[PDB]
Amino acid sequence: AVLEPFSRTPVIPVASPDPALVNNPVVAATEPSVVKIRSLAPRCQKVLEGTGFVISPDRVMTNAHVVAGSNNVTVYAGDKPFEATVVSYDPSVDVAILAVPHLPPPPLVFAAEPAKTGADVVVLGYPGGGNFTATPARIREAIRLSGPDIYGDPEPVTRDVYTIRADVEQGDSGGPLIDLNGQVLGVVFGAAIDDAETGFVLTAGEVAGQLAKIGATQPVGTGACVS
Amino acid sequence: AVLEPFSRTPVIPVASPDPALVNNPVVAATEPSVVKIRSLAPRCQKVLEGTGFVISPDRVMTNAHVVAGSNNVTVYAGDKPFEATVVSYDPSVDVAILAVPHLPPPPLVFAAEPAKTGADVVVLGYPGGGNFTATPARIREAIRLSGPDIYGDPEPVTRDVYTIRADVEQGDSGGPLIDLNGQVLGVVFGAAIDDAETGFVLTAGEVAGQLAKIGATQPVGTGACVS
Secondary structure, eight states: OOOOOOOOOOOOOOOOOOGGGGGOHHHHHHGGGEEEEEEEEGGGTEEEEEEEEEEETTEEEEOGGGTTTOSEEEEEETTEEEEOEEEEEETTTTEEEEEOTTOOSOOOOBOSSOOOTTOEEEEEEOGGGOSOEEEEEEEEEEEEEEEOOTTOOSSOEEEEEEEEESOOOTTOTTOEEEOTTSOEEEEEEEEOSSSTTEEEEEEHHHHGGGGGGTTOOSOOOOOSOOO | OOOOOOOOOOOOOOOOOOGGGGGOHHHHHHGGGEEEEEEEEGGGTEEEEEEEEEEETTEEEEOGGGTTTOSEEEEEETTEEEEOEEEEEETTTTEEEEEOTTOOSOOOOBOSSOOOTTOEEEEEEOGGGOSOEEEEEEEEEEEEEEEOOTTOOSSOEEEEEEEEESOOOTTOTTOEEEOTTSOEEEEEEEEOSSSTTEEEEEEHHHHGGGGGGTTOOSOOOOOSOOO
16 A cells, blocks of 8 residues: 655745845845836726836836736836836746836846855835835745646646745735845745745746747737636 | 515527528628638647638637637638737637738628517538538527626626527637628627527627727737636
């Protein structure tokens, strides 16, 4: 008889994030390029709020689920609204790119190399659709994560992610995980259900393919409401 | 005490469709402009097949649910495949428009006036992804139908539809309901669940708004897999 429990390796244990990261000079320097996204989604009977960041002039990256099902997307930078168009939308990888004419802040650069276990990193975003907040974090591990896409479609997806030790909050989706150099390590998208202090981040490598469509100008749809 | 059953008016009873409609000269004349659609949908672990029809040179109308979740759409006319691009996709009304370069058959015209109860009409399409089939039909009523969109999103939709007396088959979705003049009265999309010989057709008026995007050229997404 082979016994039939299911087991998996735990998320890599790492030290508590350094609380002082909230005051690291990288936070204030990066903040202008981290934007709030508000999406009206009457089909879903919701207003969605999340975070994005500038990837090139007039181009903002966020998660697909931050705009899924919506019919109007506004980007806020420096407490000012900017009209946005969804020009790339990928519910499998979970990334959207927005065209945002005349958006003042400069782009952030994706980090050239992967982060290492135990590294000090920072989640930047807008919890609750409120004020900009830096959330101290620590890298646990780069993993290949398999699971459903944002719609729960039949065929699962496999993506390169970081697990992090952090308290990721609703509204942080779409924001960057930055290193202490102010470069983007990935896009924060989720939190563990059962593992309280664990967040999930799409790696820079995982989202890189989306940039092939950065030159798009026409609106693409925003798909179904997330269940 | 007010009693609490639910009641509704029955679909309008009408005579059985005239079986001779399969041989009406309008069928053969319209057939070249009624195309088969095959959509590869690996996200949904399915191949989807339905029907569409030419609405303007190199432009085909079908239902959104005929291409929902797919990543490749082929149009077949005269037993030949044509590459297609989804350039408009509306899961609320349930209509997609395909750009189909160098598609030989001519367009069909939308009928200028609504059909009347009892009118002889014909459902044209490709049941089971097989051979072209004309299905005799009879108009029951033009109604305003409320219900969920194709994804079961929270907010219901209200659409102008015909109910018809007909045996609508899987694969007929997206095909035209034609009058005896060979003009398009609407787009066949569904069948009653409990009322066996009843089909549902989006009216010409209901789908007319989609034509505002007929000049689109860039691909839009195909949304979520229908559950």
